[PDB]
Amino acid sequence: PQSKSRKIAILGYRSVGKSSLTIQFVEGQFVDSYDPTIENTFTKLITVNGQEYHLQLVDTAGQDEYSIFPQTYSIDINGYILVYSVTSIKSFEVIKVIHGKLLDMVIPIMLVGNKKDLHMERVISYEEGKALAESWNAAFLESSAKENQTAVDVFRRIILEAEKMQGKSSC
């Protein structure tokens, strides 16, 4: 196949940078503001090891620790990006809860510590995120939605991990 279609769900607490990361990747800009309440799908082509992938990216409207896990975050998903902010302990606590609920529902998973540019506000070390990801047997990256290459790196990585392990469009 010239272009392999994949669907990726982006999960996490409100304000961690889900929309900003996704838009930096898709549009190549740091969006001034994007409605915190809106759940939308983005479409983007990316080449990974010479293979083009056609990405359907579900930018979710964010869950907290008390949220029911939407069945629609589980159907036909090829990979999950779980995002927290390195400046928010709450967001880190919440991503652990989301992960548990995700496993209950269902798996290529990666964990992303966002806002790495905000050095004065950081409260979570790289090493703490990394240790969590290892316990999940998941990939780990830190990112800033203000830095294009770090956003691109996140989406390339989930594809890399997905390919390490069905439905036809013409039939």
Partner: protein, 147 residues
């Protein structure tokens, strides 16, 4: 190995084939043309509503004078001459001088991800490679119309 491949090909034929809605078993399309014959661009006209099935059951009835250890198919779907997707199916052991009905399930992509009939029709070529294990026996092509 080249000689054995020719022998298998000479003794191999497709007798008939069905496409059925997997849920109901209702036949949507059937043919008796041997679409396995190499070197001819075969054509097939499939009902466009097939793209609305959640899953399709395909029946291939074939005869083989020669024994095969691991009979299998690779089907590459080309859209306007470019690789769109690939389908893989395995039958396994084939008894010499037997006739066999091979049933395969083909699941649809999510509804929002299906290619439209208007785009696909007359622009699809399925290239089928017939293998015994790693030995390429034969290759055929069929152009599809979704009507």
């Amino acid at each position: 190995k080249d000689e054995r491949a020719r022998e298998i090909l000479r003794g191999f034929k497709l007798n008939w084939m069905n496409l059925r809605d997997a849920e109901t078993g209702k036949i949507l399309w059937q043919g008796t043309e041997d679409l396995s014959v190499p070197g001819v661009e075969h054509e097939a006209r499939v009902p466009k509503k097939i793209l609305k099935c959640k899953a399709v059951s395909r029946e291939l009835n074939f005869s083989s004078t020669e024994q095969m250890e691991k009979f299998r198919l690779e089907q590459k779907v080309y859209f306007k001459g470019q690789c769109l997707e690939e389908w893989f199916f395995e039958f396994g052991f084939v008894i010499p001088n037997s006739t066999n009905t091979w049933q395969s399930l083909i699941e649809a992509a999510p509804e929002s991800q299906m290619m439209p009939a208007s785009v696909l029709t007359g622009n699809v070529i399925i290239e089928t490679k017939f293998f015994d294990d790693d030995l390429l026996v034969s290759t055929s092509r069929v152009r599809l119309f979704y009507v």
